[PDB]
Design a protein around this ligand. Sequence first.
Ligand code: NA
Ligand code: NA
Ligand code: NA
Ligand code: NA
Lengths: 249, 249
Amino acid sequence: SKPQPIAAANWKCNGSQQSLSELIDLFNSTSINHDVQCVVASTFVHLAMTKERLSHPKFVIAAQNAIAKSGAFTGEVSLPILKDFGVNWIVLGHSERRAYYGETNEIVADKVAAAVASGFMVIACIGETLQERESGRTAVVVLTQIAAIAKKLKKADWAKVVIAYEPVWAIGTGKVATPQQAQEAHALIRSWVSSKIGADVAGELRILYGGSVNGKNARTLYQQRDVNGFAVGGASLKPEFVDIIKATQ
Amino acid sequence: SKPQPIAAANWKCNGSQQSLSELIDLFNSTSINHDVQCVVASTFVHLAMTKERLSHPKFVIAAQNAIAKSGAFTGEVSLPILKDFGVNWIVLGHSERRAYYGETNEIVADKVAAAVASGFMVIACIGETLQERESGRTAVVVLTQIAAIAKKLKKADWAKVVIAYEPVWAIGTGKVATPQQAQEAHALIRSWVSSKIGADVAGELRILYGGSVNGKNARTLYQQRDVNGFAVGGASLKPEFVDIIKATQ
Ligand code: NA
Ligand code: NA
Ligand code: NA
Ligand code: NA
């Protein structure tokens, strides 16, 4: 059966002190009685307050990015700084950083490896664009992305790895990905991990859906065989994130 | 009379909670009896603790980077987020971001203009590399970089602008940039601002030296016509930064 599900809130580059404190207390108010790891990835600026306001025992705090080492990298935040700050979860390789901020497969893979080596739980993001999917390259791109990461890890490292599949191809179109399309990509990923890493690793690996999800379709997405939770974008800044948490049963 | 000097501590991608707390309290302990604006640019993660713990009336806090607007930019921090956080100073266009993180003259310029329009005091960084200075292209590069910024601003915006000259060319060689080399580059910048923006603007503008500054050479560097302080790298993480402050008297 499925391993422990994860409900991750990627706030992206958003938030004010007052609005986040209120959303934080909403999360604090939620009764969560099943086994699920909830994650809040705030901006670097808001990590201190999120550490301070978020008291729900099923929640942990994550960063949205880092570089591997401290030093002369003005504007960036390193893994040791986050570790010293009590942050033990991190999102790496998000489609927005791959598109805007120069993160090639190799750059993502080296960050993921460094984060695992530093003791982090890592939500490593993969996924293909619309031009890639329409040209028949979904499997090429997605398995290239994860192999680039895998080649920098050891088998035991995967206990600290979570995969988030982003259907980047669905943005801008008039139709979100279907649950069947989501399950298709998740099943492809898990099949690859079983074959190249190990069936034991594949059975314990969490593969999170990273497309648009709301309280109405989250339950159906989680009902899919190879879906272990969500890495949520805009809905994670809203009260309906609670309904997404509840959709992980 | 020179305009009010600035002593800016660019901590870059460095710091732990305990070591920054002690450094902040050292800064807090300093007796500063002349008109100078001290600036601490910490990592995003440490902005909260620097806000809480830095109580010296001559100090303000700064970010080391930002993007212009909030939205779907995972890992980045925007100007509105920093403004909501009470951060009113920012370093933009640092040579490390130009080299490593794709910040062209245009990208730097658009960030500077957005930060000024949002109410920020901006330390805008310019400077030429070794290959550029060896090519006899110091004036070409520095004046191109500042013209790219200036054309996105109006004359009154310069009341919120500080220029930091970085002698990138000096790193890696065995020769320290001399005080006279620093002064000649500042005079070039000052002369250009006078001609293209206005003599009034040039007289009020703070041009900070952003090379290797320490407690031993800071006074010699400051006692030059067109140097108005410093944007300090490694020494700003050390008690020596206090002597750099004193050198601006
Ligand atoms: Na709160
Ligand atoms: Na609170
Ligand atoms: Na259903
Ligand atoms: Na279902």
